[PDB]
Design an enzyme around this catalytic site. Structure first.
Site, PDB file in Angstrom:
ATOM      1  N   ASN A 260       7.881   8.625   6.380  1.00 22.59           N
ATOM      2  CA  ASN A 260       8.057   9.543   7.522  1.00 22.59           C
ATOM      3  C   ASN A 260       8.945   8.911   8.585  1.00 22.59           C
ATOM      4  OD1 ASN A 260       4.684   9.274   7.075  1.00 22.59           O
ATOM      5  ND2 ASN A 260       5.698  11.153   6.488  1.00 22.59           N
ATOM      6  N   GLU A 293      10.365   2.043   1.471  1.00 23.94           N
ATOM      7  CA  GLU A 293      10.172   3.060   2.495  1.00 23.94           C
ATOM      8  C   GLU A 293      11.267   2.931   3.561  1.00 23.94           C
ATOM      9  OE1 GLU A 293       8.216   5.305   1.448  1.00 23.94           O
ATOM     10  OE2 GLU A 293       7.304   3.942   0.013  1.00 23.94           O
ATOM     11  N   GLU A 315      14.325   9.577  -4.848  1.00 20.28           N
ATOM     12  CA  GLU A 315      13.443   8.548  -5.397  1.00 20.28           C
ATOM     13  C   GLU A 315      14.119   7.644  -6.426  1.00 20.28           C
ATOM     14  OE1 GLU A 315      10.995   7.743  -3.867  1.00 20.28           O
ATOM     15  OE2 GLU A 315      10.437   9.532  -2.726  1.00 20.28           O
TER      16      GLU A 315
HETATM   17  N1  LIG Z   1       9.785  -0.459  -7.318  1.00 23.82           N
HETATM   18  C1  LIG Z   1       9.341   0.883  -7.629  1.00 23.82           C
HETATM   19  C2  LIG Z   1       8.692   1.641  -6.451  1.00 23.82           C
HETATM   20  C3  LIG Z   1       8.284   2.974  -6.648  1.00 23.82           C
HETATM   21  C4  LIG Z   1       7.685   3.725  -5.628  1.00 23.82           C
HETATM   22  C5  LIG Z   1       7.465   3.182  -4.356  1.00 23.82           C
HETATM   23  C6  LIG Z   1       6.853   3.976  -3.235  1.00 23.82           C
HETATM   24  C7  LIG Z   1       6.087   5.205  -3.557  1.00 23.82           C
HETATM   25  C8  LIG Z   1       5.975   6.129  -2.327  1.00 23.82           C
HETATM   26  P1  LIG Z   1       7.394   7.159  -1.967  1.00 23.82           P
HETATM   27  O1  LIG Z   1       8.393   6.574  -0.990  1.00 23.82           O
HETATM   28  O2  LIG Z   1       8.099   7.462  -3.234  1.00 23.82           O
HETATM   29  C9  LIG Z   1       6.842   8.698  -1.275  1.00 23.82           C
HETATM   30  N2  LIG Z   1       8.101   9.513  -0.934  1.00 23.82           N
HETATM   31  C10 LIG Z   1       5.884   9.463  -2.178  1.00 23.82           C
HETATM   32  C11 LIG Z   1       5.342  10.782  -1.590  1.00 23.82           C
HETATM   33  C12 LIG Z   1       3.865  11.040  -1.586  1.00 23.82           C
HETATM   34  C13 LIG Z   1       2.949  10.186  -0.948  1.00 23.82           C
HETATM   35  C14 LIG Z   1       1.543  10.443  -0.909  1.00 23.82           C
HETATM   36  C15 LIG Z   1       1.042  11.589  -1.528  1.00 23.82           C
HETATM   37  C16 LIG Z   1       1.938  12.465  -2.165  1.00 23.82           C
HETATM   38  C17 LIG Z   1       3.326  12.188  -2.195  1.00 23.82           C
HETATM   39  C18 LIG Z   1       4.672   4.710  -4.059  1.00 23.82           C
HETATM   40  O3  LIG Z   1       3.816   5.615  -4.162  1.00 23.82           O
HETATM   41  O4  LIG Z   1       4.495   3.486  -4.292  1.00 23.82           O
HETATM   42  C19 LIG Z   1       7.874   1.866  -4.182  1.00 23.82           C
HETATM   43  C20 LIG Z   1       8.471   1.109  -5.191  1.00 23.82           C
HETATM   44 ZN   LIG Z   2      10.076   6.947  -2.382  1.00 26.38          ZN
END
Ligand SMILES: NCc1ccc(C[C@H](CP(=O)(O)[C@@H](N)CCc2ccccc2)C(=O)O)cc1
Ligand SMILES: [Zn+2]
Ligand SMILES: NCc1ccc(C[C@@H](CP(=O)(O)[C@@H](N)CCc2ccccc2)C(=O)O)cc1
Length: 866
Positions: A260, A293, A315
């Site tokens: 966010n 993030e 993503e």
């Molecule tokens: N190296 C690989 C990697 C993958 C993903 C991440 C981070 C990832 C979080 P994210 O930045 O993709 C977020 N946009 C998910 C949305 C969401 C959140 C809560 C509920 C519903 C939807 C995680 O969840 O960890 C960090 C690193």
């Molecule tokens: Zn993400």
């Protein structure tokens, strides 16, 4: 007729929202939300349609009570002005009743939000889609003693006190944003302050908010953020754009973290660590996710998604960025292999299974079901292929043009592809198929040295998936080299250049590549660096594989040679176990492993990877009529053989590693590499000599110098049938009873044990005072681990299936997201042998027969059953 959403049906919105003014009045138990929306007609005269599921108290159009209808989760106003107008909505929320952890919810006596993808509509009625971007100002009013900290996106521009003990704040976020990036936090939280100065000379105030007790564990996350901010400047030329960056930790959270704008919200798991209570892997995870993030600030926030089908636009690219950041920090080759291993272990089964989808899906019922290994990790491999095709400089030209064109917009995967193509003056039309074609491509390759040309013929095929049968040839870069009989690099001529390495670009169904000027007998090294996310079949002898493992210059291909040797050994075990005869000798494999063990020039963490055996799911890839216990038995026999055969040398390697670790127990990549090797050795030692557990237990305190060691030892003994295993676990839970993240580790050990009694230990653990089913970390640790515990989940009597089905049903009553991830434990259904298949189908039909089953779980069950 269930609602399916189709990408082909995309239409720009009839209305824009230019300004979003919000007011939160937090009370006990209810919070009242008031909005003022400044709405701009795009298609004049259409009805205004607002998404929303919160309790509705009132709705106005230009200050007058609106004539509207509320049906399901949509509010419609037919009579709307033809020019700018306002809408005011009043809703009421009971956050402590919100166990979905989407929208506005309570956790630890504090209030948090999660809006991505479609949670904002659980707070107010809104045009809750990411191509609608608005400028938010948020006022928050609450009791000062109970909620002294009141945060939302952007800049704090006003605030004050009321004489009744309440106070208020007003936050202005000047950058127009989609609703999914809204956040609010209200709580009694401690703050850790720091700062970063951008390369233009502007200070950014950094604030991390945690519980008072958790504050001493946030320092590594703060350092990681400052590292990530500096890296985005030096590697991508990207600077932060506010003078404030806030991060808030929360113990109840569906995923890892959330980007966010200016107010990131993190699962505690990805922000809290110290050496006493977190493993090296945990530290690495914080570094990765804090980076992730922050990187979203540009790849996701400044440029966002037109629609949720485009999720990988942000993503896949942000994962690529977090991978590159981590690789630039340390240990790039080992970390690359870890990422490849994760993809093959978790994404390849997805692409082979009933829920397979393209990186950019063409339809969905529930978007929360598409936050997947495919969208993220295959998505990142797709981004990485641009980098492989274009080089770093060309890749950064693409990035620069992407932001030049699309800063402030909500765009598509196609737009990213076009920026890469246009910035570099090339045609990437065929590359689009990486977004629209699901399934893992299979390459069949053959090689011969004729005259002084090595001719490499390569065929490609992509299997039908449930969404699509027709799969056309894709653009597939295959990085190659050649080794002579002594494992030395051999040069060759290709596209008018003599080098020891080249990228062969496969674009047709079948091609032959001519590597000319080859004056020695060679064996090829193929798909170096895992240059495309594919299955590659090449006829290698065991001796070829030993050569590659001993001498190749690419980390992935050396590791892949070891992996192939292990896979062939398990296959041989399967054959002997089936024919009811003695296990194979595996003489060549054992010679290869002895060499790896004894090689002091090998990087410690790389050596650890060379000593890992592929998982059961990797081993049964492509099989039909699978008995998972037979694969488990063959894999276990191999591990037993490796453990016992080399027992003295496992002890010896452990001692070497301990000496080199040199009592440096804090997190560093160097010390961590030694510990990783140490923990591989412990696992093998305690397999060969379970009685060694009493020797470990006697000196436990001496060994328990950080959590990497405690976790490594408990992991190593976790399948031990000794009572000491149970005692050590109980002592662990007592020691760390006050640390919820360590208690997650306890529950993961309970759930993952290959001991015979794991189902009843898991059922006892459901009633442990520190367990909560409504906490996703706890549910994933205990029940998720059990669902992945091959001998128990796939027990012949079906007890594992019934248990997991029971928990899907129970969890779905309050958190469909956690339940819909859990139910994918059943994705192997149609590939199981008949007895288990029958039981899995019974389990799935029972889930389906639940009244009120969520759309989330129903969509998954339908893909498996129907
Ligand atoms: N190296 C690989 C990697 C993958 C993903 C991440 C981070 C990832 C979080 P994210 O930045 O993709 C977020 N946009 C998910 C949305 C969401 C959140 C809560 C509920 C519903 C939807 C995680 O969840 O960890 C960090 C690193
Ligand atoms: Zn993400
Ligand atoms: N193109 C539409 C648009 C663009 C940018 C914005 C963003 C706003 C942000 P802002 O008013 O808080 C500015 N004072 C922050 C400067 C800064 C940067 C880095 C470190 C410290 C301080 C702007 O910069 O004007 C708002 C809308």
């Amino acid at each position: 007729s269930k609602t399916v959403h189709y990408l082909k049906d995309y239409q720009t919105p009839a209305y824009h929202i230019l300004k979003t003014d919000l007011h939160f009045d937090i009370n006990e138990p209810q919070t009242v939300v008031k909005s003022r929306l400044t709405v701009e007609p795009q298609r004049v005269g259409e009805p205004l349609v607002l998404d929303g599921s919160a309790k509705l108290l009132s709705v106005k159009i230009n200050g007058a009570a609106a004539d509207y209808v509320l049906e399901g989760e949509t509010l419609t106003i037919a009579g709307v002005p033809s020019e700018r107008f306002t809408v005011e909505v009043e809703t009421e929320i009971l956050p402590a009743e919100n166990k979905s952890l989407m929208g506005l919810y309570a956790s630890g006596g504090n209030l948090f939000t999660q809006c991505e993808p479609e949670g904002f509509r659980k707070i107010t009625f809104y045009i809750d889609r990411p191509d609608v971007m608005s400028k938010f100002t948020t006022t928050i009013v609450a009791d000062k003693k109970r909620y002294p900290v009141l945060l939302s996106n952007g800049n704090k521009i006003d605030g004050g006190e009321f004489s009744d003990g309440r106070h208020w704040v007003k936050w202005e976020d000047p950058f127009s944003k989609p609703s999914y990036l809204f956040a609010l936090v209200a709580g009694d939280l401690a703050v850790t302050e720091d700062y970063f100065t951008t390369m233009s000379g502007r200070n950014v105030k950094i604030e991390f908010y945690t519980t008072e007790a958790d504050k001493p564990k946030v320092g590594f996350a703060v350092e990681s953020l400052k590292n990530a901010m500096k890296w985005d400047e030096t590697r991508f030329g990207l600077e932060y754009d506010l003078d404030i960056f806030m991060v808030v930790a929360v113990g109840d959270f569906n995923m890892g973290a959330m980007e966010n704008k200016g107010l990131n919200i993190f699962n505690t798991k990805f922000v809290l660590a110290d050496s006493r209570t977190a493993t090296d892997t945990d530290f690495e995870g914080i570094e990765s996710v804090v980076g992730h993030e922050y990187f979203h600030n540009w790849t996701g926030n400044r440029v966002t998604c037109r629609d949720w089908f485009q999720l990988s636009l942000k993503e896949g690219l942000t994962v690529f960025r977090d991978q590159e950041f981590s690789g630039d920090r340390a240990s790039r080759a080992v970390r690359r292999i870890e990422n490849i291993r994760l993809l093959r272990q978790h994404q390849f089964p997805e692409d082979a299974g009933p829920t397979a989808h393209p990186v950019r899906p063409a339809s969905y019922e529930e978007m929360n079901n598409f936050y997947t290994m495919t969208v993220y990790e295959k998505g990142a491999e797709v981004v990485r292929m641009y980098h492989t095709l274009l080089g770093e400089e060309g890749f950064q030209k693409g990035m620069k043009l992407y932001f030049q064109r699309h800063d402030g917009q909500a765009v598509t995967c196609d737009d990213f592809r076009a920026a890469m193509a246009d910035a570099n003056g090339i045609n990437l039309d065929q590359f689009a198929l990486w977004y629209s074609q699901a399934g893992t491509p299979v390459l069949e390759a053959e090689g011969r040295l004729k005259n002084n040309i090595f001719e490499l013929t390569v065929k490609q095929t992509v299997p039908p998936t449930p969404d699509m049968t027709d799969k056309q040839p894709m653009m597939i870069p295959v990085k190659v080299g050649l080794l002579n009989r002594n494992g030395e690099a051999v040069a060759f001529d290709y596209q008018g250049k003599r080098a020891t390495e080249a990228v062969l670009l496969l674009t047709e169904a079948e091609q032959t590549f001519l590597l000319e000027g080859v004056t020695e007998a060679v064996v090829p090294s193929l798909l170096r660096g895992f240059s495309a996310p594919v299955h590659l079949n090449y006829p290698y002898s065991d001796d070829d594989l030993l050569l590659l493992l001993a001498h190749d210059s690419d980390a992935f291909t050396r590791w892949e040679a070891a992996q192939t040797l292990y896979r062939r050994a398990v296959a041989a075990n399967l054959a002997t176990l089936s024919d009811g005869v003695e296990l194979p000798k595996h003489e060549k494999l054992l010679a290869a492993v002895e060499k790896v063990i004894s090689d002091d020039l090998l990087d410690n963490a790389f050596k650890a990877l060379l000593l890992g055996v592929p998982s059961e799911a990797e081993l049964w890839d492509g099989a039909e009529n699978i008995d998972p216990l037979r694969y488990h038995q063959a894999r276990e026999a191999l591990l037993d053989t490796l453990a016992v055969h080399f027992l003295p040398k496992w002890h010896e390697l452990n001692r070497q590693a301990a000496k080199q670790e040199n009592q440096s127990y804090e997190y560093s990549p160097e010390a961590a590499g030694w510990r990783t090797l140490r923990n591989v050795c412990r696992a093998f030692v305690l397999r060969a000599d379970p009685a060694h557990i009493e020797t470990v237990a006697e000196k436990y305190g001496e060994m328990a110098q950080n959590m990497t060691h405690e976790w490594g030892i408990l992991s190593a003994v976790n399948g031990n049938e000794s009572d000491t295993r149970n005692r050590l676990l109980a002592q662990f839970a007592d020691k760390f009873s006050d640390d919820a993240l360590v208690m997650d580790k306890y529950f993961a050990l309970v759930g993952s044990s290959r001991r015979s009694d794991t189902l009843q230990q898991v059922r006892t653990a459901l009633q442990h005072p520190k367990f909560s089913l409504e906490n996703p970390n706890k549910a994933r640790s205990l029940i998720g681990s059990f669902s992945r515990n091959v001998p128990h989940f796939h027990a012949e009597d079906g007890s594992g299936y019934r248990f997991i089905a029971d928990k899907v049903i129970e969890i779905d009553r309050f958190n469909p997201q956690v339940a819909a991830r859990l139910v994918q434990a059943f994705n192997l259904c149609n590939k199981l042998e008949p007895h288990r298949k029958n039981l899995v189908k019974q389990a799935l039909q029972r889930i389906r027969a639940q009244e009120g089953l969520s759309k989330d779980v129903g969509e998954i069950v339908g893909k498996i059953l129907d």
